[PDB]
From a paper:
Here we describe an alternative form, termed N-VelcroVax, a VLP vaccine platform assembled from a monomeric HBc protein (N-anti-SUMO Affimer HBc 190) with the Affimer inserted at the N-terminus. HBc protein monomers comprise either 183 or 185 amino acids and dimerise to produce structural subunits which assemble to form icosahedral VLPs with T = 3 (90 dimers) or T = 4 (120 dimers) morphologies.
N-VelcroVax VLP samples were vitrified for cryo-EM data collection. This confirmed two different sizes of icosahedral particles. Reconstructions of each particle stack with icosahedral symmetry imposed revealed that these corresponded to T = 3 and T = 4 configurations, as expected. Unstructured internal density was also observed, possibly representing non-specific binding of nucleic acid derived from the E. coli expression system. Processing of cryo-EM data yielded density maps for T = 3 and T = 4 VLPs resolved to 3.0 Å and 3.5 Å, respectively. Initial inspection of density maps revealed no additional density attributable to bound SUMO-gp1, although there appeared to be a subtle change in the orientations of the Affimers, with these being closer together in the N-VelcroVax:SUMO-gp1 complex map compared to the unliganded N-VelcroVax map. However, for N-VelcroVax, in which Affimers are attached at the N-terminus and spatially constrained between the four-helix bundles, Affimer density was resolved. This suggests that the Affimers in the N-VelcroVax system are more rigidly constrained in their position compared to when presented at the MIR region.
Author numbering:
A (entry chain D): 14 to 52, 59 to 83, 89 to 185, 194 to 258
B (entry chain C): 14 to 52, 59 to 83, 89 to 186, 198 to 257
C (entry chain B), F (entry chain B): 14 to 52, 59 to 83, 89 to 184, 194 to 258
D (entry chain A), E (entry chain A): 14 to 52, 59 to 83, 89 to 186, 198 to 258
Amino acid sequence: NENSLEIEELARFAVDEHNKKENALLEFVRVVKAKEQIIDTMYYLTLEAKDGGKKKLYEAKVWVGLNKYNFKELQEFKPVGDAGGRMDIDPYKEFGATVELLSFLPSDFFPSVRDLLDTASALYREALESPEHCSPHHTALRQAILAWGELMTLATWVGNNPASRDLVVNYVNTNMGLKIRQLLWFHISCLTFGRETVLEYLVSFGVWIRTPPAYRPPNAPILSTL
Amino acid sequence: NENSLEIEELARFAVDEHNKKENALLEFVRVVKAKEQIIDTMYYLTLEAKDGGKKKLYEAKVWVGLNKYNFKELQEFKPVGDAGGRMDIDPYKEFGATVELLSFLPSDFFPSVRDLLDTASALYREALESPEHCSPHHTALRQAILAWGELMTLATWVGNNLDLVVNYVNTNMGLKIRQLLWFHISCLTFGRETVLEYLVSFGVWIRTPPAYRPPNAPILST
Amino acid sequence: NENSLEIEELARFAVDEHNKKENALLEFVRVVKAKEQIIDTMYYLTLEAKDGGKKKLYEAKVWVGLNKYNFKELQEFKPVGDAGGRMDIDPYKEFGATVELLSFLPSDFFPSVRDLLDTASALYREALESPEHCSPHHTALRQAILAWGELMTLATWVGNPASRDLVVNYVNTNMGLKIRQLLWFHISCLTFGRETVLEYLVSFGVWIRTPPAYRPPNAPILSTL
Amino acid sequence: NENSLEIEELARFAVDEHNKKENALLEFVRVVKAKEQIIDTMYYLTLEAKDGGKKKLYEAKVWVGLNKYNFKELQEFKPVGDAGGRMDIDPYKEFGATVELLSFLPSDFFPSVRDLLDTASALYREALESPEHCSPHHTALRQAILAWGELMTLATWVGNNLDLVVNYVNTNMGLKIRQLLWFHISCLTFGRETVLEYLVSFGVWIRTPPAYRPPNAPILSTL
Amino acid sequence: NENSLEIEELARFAVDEHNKKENALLEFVRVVKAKEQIIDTMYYLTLEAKDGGKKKLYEAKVWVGLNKYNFKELQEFKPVGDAGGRMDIDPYKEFGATVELLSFLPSDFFPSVRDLLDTASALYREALESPEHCSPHHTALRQAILAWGELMTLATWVGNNLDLVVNYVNTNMGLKIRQLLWFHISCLTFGRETVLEYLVSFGVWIRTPPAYRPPNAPILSTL
Amino acid sequence: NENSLEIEELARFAVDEHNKKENALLEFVRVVKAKEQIIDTMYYLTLEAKDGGKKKLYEAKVWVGLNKYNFKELQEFKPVGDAGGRMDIDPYKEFGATVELLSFLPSDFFPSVRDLLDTASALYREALESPEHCSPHHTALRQAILAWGELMTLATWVGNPASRDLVVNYVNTNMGLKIRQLLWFHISCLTFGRETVLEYLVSFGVWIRTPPAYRPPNAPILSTL
């Protein structure tokens, strides 16, 4: 049952099983989902546990009076979410940059997502929507635009459907929007001005933003062709 | 004031001003934000206006005892997020496929995203992490993996704040990331033309009646 | 009028006068519509009358108190154009095959019409929507897809009792099996070549004509190789 | 059974499962067809789920006291008919025209289906029955003749067992047959470029106000 | 303020200062707009000065007890709108015609704006949306379509906040749009010299008395 | 009539019949004009009805004491032609640029339309009045000048309360900003060359997209050099 304590005893036996076999320390405290399925039954539970205080959604799968004093052994302990830095991929390791080279510019230096998308559809709409990879900045820019598209359909999903679920809309509109603004800015600018120009402009704007306000020249470096 | 009636009247003035000027019909429901800036009061409203069955947010800039007895005037009603469908981009058009060719295969054909990320990290990790454009498949694979990373980071954020959204991600964005990861991993392994032929072969194999096709499903291997 | 005995007598003497003049076997039941044009009434006798026993239509036109006792004579008795196929066209005869070559394939050899349409779309959509011909198979495929679409708008329209529910059943199975044969033949002649599909239909005819006891237990499969 | 309460509850459960997986407003009204098969009991449930006032044939498959204490599992909400606009074929686009261009010609410009079928059977019956491709217009004309044949056999079928659907075909579905037959007969008779220039000049004729249009509407001729 | 006596005396002083510098008969009636800015106090005075029965929007700028014991200094009497006939552009003169020549055709010869816009969207929509110059007629036709778009958005704007100005556009400003659309669609379809000879021959047709003109008014055709 | 409930019932059953037949969302308030043609009244139902909530027009035509109890059916429901731009034309797309490239320039970057017209006149009047093309910029410049002139005759006509005073304000600012963008773009592409104006719009977009804190304090200037 969902409310009964037998699922809690089941995944609690699973969690001290873990702390015995794999030198683990997890604090299973509650169950959101615990499926029941008869074949002996085939339970499917998820166990949420503090990992040094940090929560993580796992999945429990144990082949089990008659449901407590039975043959009891877990077989799989698969967690939910492989996106845990298991590959440290840098979006800008190709093309010459790094991530921390793109931290020379401040956070609110980048244009909006609307202004960058108007820029991309201004100068490069024919080359983006095209049956050829023109250049690697296009292959990255197409994926960046579609990623922002599916993020905004998720935003209108959670906006259409408790009642204070606008905070997640603000979270996607800012915190992932910043990464997509950097990733759009970098590729539009490397397409327009050349890749060496953006990479040395990043250093020159770095130097400009290093210096204190009393000694900073009043005209920042800027990308131009004039 | 952050929850007054005057910001609600300002939101009604903004929504009927946009309705009269830019020729739309937006039914305002609720306000989510109001930033006061004294220079005359320069307000900064963001309100959600119901539109045809879709509750969507809208940023506003109005400038207005002394507050309501003043010349209020709307300067901007642009929405949030540019995704109104202004670019038609396939993820698979520079490669030779289309999106309909990858929905030719069944939905549950594609291995789950855990298995595909393990397949990617077990086989191309020293090229998906190196400073080269080895191929466009690597260049699209990197952005697909990092987009899934942002999506799962958002999933753990919503879990640790405020669920149906965590499985909504896996049903909807998970299927497109499964097709994308499958396509690029298989195109790196077996070649691109071999995957483009396998797609139509497995498609027409799953369409035929079972008594008139080869009995075992197509696999691609070496 | 419409339900009067005068229109029925008009049509009775019409079918009997056809029996005098042009000598075909004919009998009559019902007029479905009789418009009038008085100038001497130039009737429009859309009368159903049986050449061969069946309820087919004969639009007639006669020159007729005084409406009974006057001259009655036929100048027009013609049906609606192509009665049952005045020309005998074979939809595969230009492509090598015939209908007699494809009448051996069973009713469930063909995938469902959604699956044939999805195969056609998802495998040749850029060539079925181009302004070029590129093949006669693409031309017949375009017309076949549009004919099925026109028929599906009818299937939607009739849904707007069980009468409409069996009309949808008719237009999905009975016609629709012809759409599936046409769609299969054209996307298979494009996929595998055309001589390969004709050789496959020959050898599948040999397989399906054999009794179940004296043939290999599973049908030939189509693939180009 | 077919008309009892269990398949109604099963179809309502299937339509709310569809509202869980695809998240729409599908309103179930009546079960169309139903098959009850033992295996555990399998069902081939043809239900009708109305969509905001429009009706389309849909399907359900929910494998189910002993049949009700079981895992009720839905697998599909497939449509019956692939006419969801998934492919936009233009029947004239391969021939230089479009349906934008054949609406210069009004609805009642076109000759009747009888008058076009006997023009085809008078002028091209040898080559519309011959085993070669003489043109793309021949291939496109054979199909239109045969599709009218299927429409007429559906008309005489529905006139045998049960109204006004017989004159839904001959007008509303017969209009596009008349357009196709006119276009292909006229392109075989007068040439293709002559039919395109005729469509343009008939657009100029029907475009002008009635005070200044000439009374002789433009016509195709060769002599 | 806006409606008091000081801006009325200020506007009358501005209009007699205009009668001192340009020496005409401009009759001030009412202040249209007014802005009061401190500096000494600056004014952006939009006054209306009627000119012998005709009205045109004009402007005044008179920089002024303490505000009235000051040097009241006018600097401009500028018009609002450069349509004083300062440049005489003919929209057809680059194409061989003139508006003297397109008045052979009467007012109601021209097809409606709908019937010309869908002829353009049926026959040239690919090249009227493509990033190259295919002709001067294409460049001249894109602008006429977009100017009709601006006229229609002004029509639906004035139909949202407040009459009969909505049918001032569609008739009186729509007539020149119909003339431009007819001229450019017909020059793209039939050639340019054919449209000039058609204008000449329609002048011959509408010129003759009704006893001897043929009933078929001349028409453009290619077949 | 005009204000009768019969015309409103005609238009109500018209919009409901559109909902049955062609399946669009629709609701109705007002008929603005209903002409009549009796032969059986062939009405001209210029009824405003909302596809999407807005007050757009539907000119309809119906065949209808006996005027209530008769057959009512639609054969015509069409709006006025180009509803909102059936074709999507970009006024700068042939000239290299787009509207997305020029939407970054602020509203006061452009000189007033008198100053752009005086620049056009006093700098290219002999070439804007010649019978030669000489450029597509001259062609678009001629049409832009004439469009503004036609709009200014309307601004004069509406002046012949505050309603006309805000209509003149609309036609001077809202349209008129488009005239200023068009006039600026064409006289600047003629003055400075065309690639120079496109490069200037790129670099001005970079300047205006930057926040005020992280850009040089004054905009790029346009000159050929």
